[PDB]
Amino acid sequence: SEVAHRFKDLGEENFKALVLIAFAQYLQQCPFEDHVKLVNEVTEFAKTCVADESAENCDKSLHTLFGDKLCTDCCAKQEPERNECFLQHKDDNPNLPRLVRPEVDVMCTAFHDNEETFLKKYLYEIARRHPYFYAPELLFFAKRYKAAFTECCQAADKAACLLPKLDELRDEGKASSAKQRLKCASLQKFGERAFKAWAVAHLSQRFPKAEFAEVSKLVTDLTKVHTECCHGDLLECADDRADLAKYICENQDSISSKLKECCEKPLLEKSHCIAEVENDEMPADLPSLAADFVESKDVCKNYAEAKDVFLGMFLYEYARRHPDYSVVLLLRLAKTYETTLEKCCAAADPHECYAKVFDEFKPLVEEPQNLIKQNCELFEQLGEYKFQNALLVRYTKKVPQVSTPTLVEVSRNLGKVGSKCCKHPEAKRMPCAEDYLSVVLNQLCVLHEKTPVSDRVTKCCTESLVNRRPCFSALEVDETYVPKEFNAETFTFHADICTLSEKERQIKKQTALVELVKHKPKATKEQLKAVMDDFAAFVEKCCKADDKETCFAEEGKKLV
Ligand SMILES: N[C@@H](Cc1cc(I)c(Oc2cc(I)c(O)c(I)c2)c(I)c1)C(=O)O
Ligand SMILES: N[C@@H](Cc1cc(I)c(Oc2cc(I)c(O)c(I)c2)c(I)c1)C(=O)O
Ligand SMILES: N[C@@H](Cc1cc(I)c(Oc2cc(I)c(O)c(I)c2)c(I)c1)C(=O)O
Numbered sequence: 062s063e064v065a066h067r068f069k070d071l072g073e074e075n076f077k078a079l080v081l082i083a084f085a086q087y088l089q090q091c092p093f094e095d096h097v098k099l100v101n102e103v104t105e106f107a108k109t110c111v112a113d114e115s116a117e118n119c120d121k122s123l124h125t126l127f128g129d130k131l132c133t134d135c136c137a138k139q140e141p142e143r144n145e146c147f148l149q150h151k152d153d154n155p156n157l158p159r160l161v162r163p164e165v166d167v168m169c170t171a172f173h174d175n176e177e178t179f180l181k182k183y184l185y186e187i188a189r190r191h192p193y194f195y196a197p198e199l200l201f202f203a204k205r206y207k208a209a210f211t212e213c214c215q216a217a218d219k220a221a222c223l224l225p226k227l228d229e230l231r232d233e234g235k236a237s238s239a240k241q242r243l244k245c246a247s248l249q250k251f252g253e254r255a256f257k258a259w260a261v262a263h264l265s266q267r268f269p270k271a272e273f274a275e276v277s278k279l280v281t282d283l284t285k286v287h288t289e290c291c292h293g294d295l296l297e298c299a300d301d302r303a304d305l306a307k308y309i310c311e312n313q314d315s316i317s318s319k320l321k322e323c324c325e326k327p328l329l330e331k332s333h334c335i336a337e338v339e340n341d342e343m344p345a346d347l348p349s350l351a352a353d354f355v356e357s358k359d360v361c362k363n364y365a366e367a368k369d370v371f372l373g374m375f376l377y378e379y380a381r382r383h384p385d386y387s388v389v390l391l392l393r394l395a396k397t398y399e400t401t402l403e404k405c406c407a408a409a410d411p412h413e414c415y416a417k418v419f420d421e422f423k424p425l426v427e428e429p430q431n432l433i434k435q436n437c438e439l440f441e442q443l444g445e446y447k448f449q450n451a452l453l454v455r456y457t458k459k460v461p462q463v464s465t466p467t468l469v470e471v472s473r474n475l476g477k478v479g480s481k482c483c484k485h486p487e488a489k490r491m492p493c494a495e496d497y498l499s500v501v502l503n504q505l506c507v508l509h510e511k512t513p514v515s516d517r518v519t520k521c522c523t524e525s526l527v528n529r530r531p532c533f534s535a536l537e538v539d540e541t542y543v544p545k546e547f548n549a550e551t552f553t554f555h556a557d558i559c560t561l562s563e564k565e566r567q568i569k570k571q572t573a574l575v576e577l578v579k580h581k582p583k584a585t586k587e588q589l590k591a592v593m594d595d596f597a598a599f600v601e602k603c604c605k606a607d608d609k610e611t612c613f614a615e616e617g618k619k620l621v
């Protein structure tokens with residue numbers, strides 16, 4: 062019995078949580094209460110199978126079981142065409158209501174009145190809004206979330222206790238989700254082989270001391286865990302993750318020095334820890350790379366004889382000695398190495414042909430460096446806000462067809478690269494920046510894929526996972542784009558507009574800025590400022606009240 066197998070390994074609590082998430086991620090619109098039930102029904106059924114492994118229907122597969130329940134066009138199908146359906150219907154941008162937070166005390170009263178339905182609510186909302194969220198990590202969040210309510214709903218200043226914590230959690234959660242989406246997207250759109258090279262590059266950087274054989278073992282298990290969470294097999298994913306978590310800590314020595322701290326803590330805490338671990342120190346006298354990959358005579362022999370291993374070795378070797386290189390950069394290098402061998406080994410004298418292969422990397426290594434240098438200079442200069450506006454303008458000219466909410470969204474996060482990476486030494490900027498940009502550009506890709514409107518986005522997004530950043534960067538202003546006419550509907554007054562926070566204000570102002578650029582593509586940084594200002598002055602004036610609605614309306618109609 063598979064149900065019981067999992068129930069036994071994860072325990073009832075985690076099992077009930079994981080199953081809830083599984084349902085919330087498959088049916089994002091359904092009411093909270095409805096899901097809960099299904100869980101209860103399913104959780105009980107497992108218990109019986111735990112009792113009688115031979116009980117009725119305990120021989121079923123988790124997908125069949127869960128699917129059937131969910132069905133009480135997708136349902137009218139059968140396994141596995143039926144499950145592929147639910148996956149295929151996950152909405153990365155559901156039309157769900159805003160999930161704002163009530164009044165501190167209002168929540169607490171609920172956190173107390175009924176504590177289990179409270180957390181189930183948490184796991185429920187997050188899961189439905191992020192159908193790809195990493196189940197395990199979400200449990201970790203669930204705890205940290207409950208903690209806050211247990212240490213803040215009982216103290217002097219609570220809204221000054223809780224809130225600050227609730228902030229940091231939504232941010233970490235958003236980063237987590239964005240991170241897992243890249244992983245699922247990597248797998249689904251480019252295959253596991255693409256994901257494996259990627260993970261190989263990442264672990265070789267975090268574990269330079271580790272042996273290639275060890276890193277491979279980790280990547281294989283790691284590939285299995287993510288395929289599962291990405292494909293809905295949450296229960297098995299949580300199970301398999303814990304095994305790996307346990308494995309890593311046991312062989313901790315032959316892997317990384319930084320795992321020591323991680324291993325002492327509880328399951329969830331130590332898994333999150335490993336997931337966040339910093340690069341171990343890099344071994345000293347390491348044999349030059351050229352020796353085995355350029356100078357050797359067996360280069361072509363090994364390529365033919367075992368390309369997959371040989372190339373994996375190349376990635377592993379290069380990555381481990383270059384923590385100063387973004388993983389996508391290394392992947393390009395690996396790709397270049399292969400192309401060069403693909404041609405060279407057919408050539409007359411292979412040794413001469415692939416002899417200067419390191420030469421061809423130089424260009425590929427400098428490109429990311431200069432760019433990172435440039436925007437960090439620009440950042441020290443403009444600051445987060447003014448920086449995002451620079452990007453916002455830049456990217457709206459590249460892909461005008463893309464809707465405003467998304468352009469503002471993506472540009473904002475592209476702007477956070479600066480505050481999140483430039484406060485680092487050269488040696489640690491590229492991996493920070495370029496690998497962070499991969500996450501943000503993937504948000505664009507997945508959000509744009511639900512209703513494509515720009516071939517330029519689609520081409521860059523689908524052509525290669527590794528060239529995305531170069532692809533977007535290289536993009537010139539879309540000239541075929543026809544200016545969006547003026548539509549006052551965008552700025553229709555709304556009471557809330559005058560009583561906005563600094564964050565909310567900037568988003569309105571940035572929305573305005575995109576709408577402006579979309580309307581006058583050929584504007585100047587200067588003439589854009591002018592317009593933004595007059596408008597800013599207008600809104601500020603009209604907010605200084607009297608009859609607000611009239612000023613905005615009266616004076617607005619005048620501007621329009
Ligand atoms: N920028 C990437 C780099 C990165 C990728 C992987 I693959 C990885 O290995 C794990 C192991 C476990 I256990 C997890 O639960 C997770 I998530 C990732 C680690 I460490 C770092 C990221 O941080 O995603
Ligand atoms: N004033 C600078 C020009 C400059 C403007 C921007 I806006 C910028 O920021 C990005 C960030 C990303 I991410 C891209 O993909 C791209 I293209 C540009 C950078 I770096 C440089 C000079 O003259 O030196
Ligand atoms: N219709 C929206 C409300 C809304 C009104 C205005 I007027 C507006 O325009 C600006 C322009 C600048 I420049 C600012 O600094 C600010 I604040 C607002 C925007 I964007 C949105 C709703 O229904 O929610």
Ligand SMILES: N[C@@H](Cc1cc(I)c(Oc2cc(I)c(O)c(I)c2)c(I)c1)C(=O)O
Nearest residue numbers: 547573574575576577580592593596620621
């Ligand atoms: N009189 C013109 C219409 C027009 C109205 C406005 I108000 C305006 O100014 C802004 C400012 C911001 I900020 C925006 O995001 C946008 I869109 C337009 C511009 I330029 C032109 C005609 O019909 O010929």
